[PDB]
Amino acid sequence: QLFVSPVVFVTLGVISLLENILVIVAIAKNKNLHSPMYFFICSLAVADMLVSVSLGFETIVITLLNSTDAQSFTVNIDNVIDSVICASLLASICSLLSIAVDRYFTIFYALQYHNIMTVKRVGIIISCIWAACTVSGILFIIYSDSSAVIICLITMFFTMLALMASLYVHMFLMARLHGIDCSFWNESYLTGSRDERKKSLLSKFGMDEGVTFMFIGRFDRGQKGVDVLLKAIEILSSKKEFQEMRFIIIGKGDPELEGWARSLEEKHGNVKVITEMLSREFVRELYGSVDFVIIPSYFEPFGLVALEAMCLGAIPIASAVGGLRDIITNETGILVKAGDPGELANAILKALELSRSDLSKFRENCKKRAMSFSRQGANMKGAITLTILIGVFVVCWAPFFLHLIFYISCPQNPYCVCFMSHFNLYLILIMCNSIINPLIYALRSQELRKTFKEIICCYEFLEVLFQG
Amino acid sequence: LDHXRWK
Ligand SMILES: [Ca+2]
Numbered sequence: 001q002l003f004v005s006p007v008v009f010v011t012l013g014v015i016s017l018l019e020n021i022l023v024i025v026a027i028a029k030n031k032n033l034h035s036p037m038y039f040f041i042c043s044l045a046v047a048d049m050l051v052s053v054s055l056g057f058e059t060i061v062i063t064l065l066n067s068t069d070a071q072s073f074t075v076n077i078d079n080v081i082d083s084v085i086c087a088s089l090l091a092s093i094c095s096l097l098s099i100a101v102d103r104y105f106t107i108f109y110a111l112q113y114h115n116i117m118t119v120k121r122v123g124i125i126i127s128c129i130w131a132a133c134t135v136s137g138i139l140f141i142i143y144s145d146s147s148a149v150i151i152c153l154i155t156m157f158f159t160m161l162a163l164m165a166s167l168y169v170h171m172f173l174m175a176r177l178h179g180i181d182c183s184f185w186n187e188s189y190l191t192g193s194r195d196e197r198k199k200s201l202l203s204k205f206g207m208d209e210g211v212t213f214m215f216i217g218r219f220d221r222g223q224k225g226v227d228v229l230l231k232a233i234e235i236l237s238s239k240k241e242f243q244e245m246r247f248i249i250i251g252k253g254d255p256e257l258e259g260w261a262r263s264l265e266e267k268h269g270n271v272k273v274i275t276e277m278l279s280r281e282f283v284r285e286l287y288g289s290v291d292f293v294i295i296p297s298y299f300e301p302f303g304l305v306a307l308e309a310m311c312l313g314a315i316p317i318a319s320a321v322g323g324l325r326d327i328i329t330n331e332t333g334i335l336v337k338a339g340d341p342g343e344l345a346n347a348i349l350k351a352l353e354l355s356r357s358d359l360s361k362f363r364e365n366c367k368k369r370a371m372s373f374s375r376q377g378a379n380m381k382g383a384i385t386l387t388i389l390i391g392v393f394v395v396c397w398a399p400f401f402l403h404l405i406f407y408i409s410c411p412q413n414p415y416c417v418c419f420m421s422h423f424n425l426y427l428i429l430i431m432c433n434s435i436i437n438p439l440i441y442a443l444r445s446q447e448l449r450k451t452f453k454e455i456i457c458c459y460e461f462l463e464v465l466f467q468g
Numbered sequence: 469l470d471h472x473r474w475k
Contacts, residue, residue: 001475009471055471055472058471058472059471062469062470062471065469074469075469078469082472082473085472085473086473141473144473144474150474400472403474404474407474420475423471423472423475424471427471427472430472
């Protein structure tokens with residue numbers, strides 16, 4: 001076994017104890033950090049502290065025995081120490097998963113999650129997490145020799161690894177796929193009122209002032225659903241309500257659908273078709289002029305199409321598919337069944353009736369919703385914090401869990417034995433998870449840094465009052 | 469008894 005001085009385990013356990021107490025004290029002392037996310041960061045801080053305190057205390061207990069077997073007493077103390085480490089490891093997984101649940105629901109169902117997750121409900125959930133993890137942790141140490149327990153912990157680590165892989169793929173690799181660009185899609189690029197922007201836009205296409213509906217995307221059968229909209233305009237054609245409606249259809253593709261759109265354009269007059277790929281700057285002006293944006297997509301994994309429109313006040317009429325279903329709410333748009341022209345025609349009729357009242361607040365809801373999905377926003381920055389925290393967990397626990405994989409799969413293999421002999425370094429990396437996490441919380445939370453700065457000033461006064 | 473478990 002690879003030697004590391006017992007004092008390293010004790011000192012790292014002290015540094016972790018000092019750091020994580022400061023984290024728990026800061027969240028409790030500051031009412032600004034009294035949100036479910038920081039409460040789940042608090043349970044994670046307890047779990048981190050308890051792991052390093054138990055590993056530090058265990059090292060003190062082992063060194064004491066090497067200095068002085070003491071029968072069952074040492075085995076009983078070992079089982080209790082290992083149960084606290086197991087319980088806290090399960091609780092740390094549960095806490096990170098709870099921050100993952102917190103972030104997913106604050107990103108998509110912000111108002112809904114906030115009303116549900118009260119200080120009482122989050123207090124119950126954390127208590128239930130720790131109650132189930134202490135029960136499971138004790139049971140896991142009883143059947144530590146059993147494969148089922150070791151396989152369960154390895155599966156739980158592989159779940160966290162799969163969570164890290166999917167979060168890194170979303171937050172960093174797919175960053176520019178679903179991330180809204182607030183520097184470009186800004187209402188500051190628009191001049192005048194929406195009434196005059198719509199008036200000028202409709203006058204440019206030789207049309208009267210009416211409820212303007214806009215389509216942007218490829219002309220294809222089974223993807224962006226231009227066919228659904230073209231069928232819906234034909235359904236609306238017979239209705240008297242269609243005369244108060246205006247349609248701007250942009251995109252290229254299928255000559256069959258291009259020719260269909262151009263045929264309805266010359267047939268109705270309130271229908272305008274641009275069979276050209278327009279510049280994002282002009283699409284932005286269209287989003288800020290039109291009343292509604294119709295996204296009748298059969299498939300749209302990223303709500304970016306709706307997000308871009310919502311930024312500039314355009315109320316989206318999209319399909320309840322992928323990202324559109326997630327981004328659009330009752331307050332921020334109208335959702336319809338994909339591939340249903342009859343339901344879309346009714347949604348355009350609903351939108352026409354909706355426009356008779358003041359849509360000013362509806363657009364403000366769209367703007368506020370689209371704004372919360374920006375990378376510079378508190379919701380996305382928290383998801384990046386979550387990816388860093390899970391990333392740090394996975395990296396710090398990976399050698400231990402590979403050691404655990406090796407323990408049950410290849411304990412006889414010299415290549416596994418050589419890796420398994422550096423177990424003390426893997427425990428040191430577990431100590432580091434409890435030291436790196438408080439450094440991340442401070443780095444990612446400006447408010448927690450401020451509260452930490454108040455404790456270093458109060459500790460200077462504590463030591464001053466201690467001597468005098 | 470040793471440091472951690474499954475060493
Ligand atoms: Ca032990």
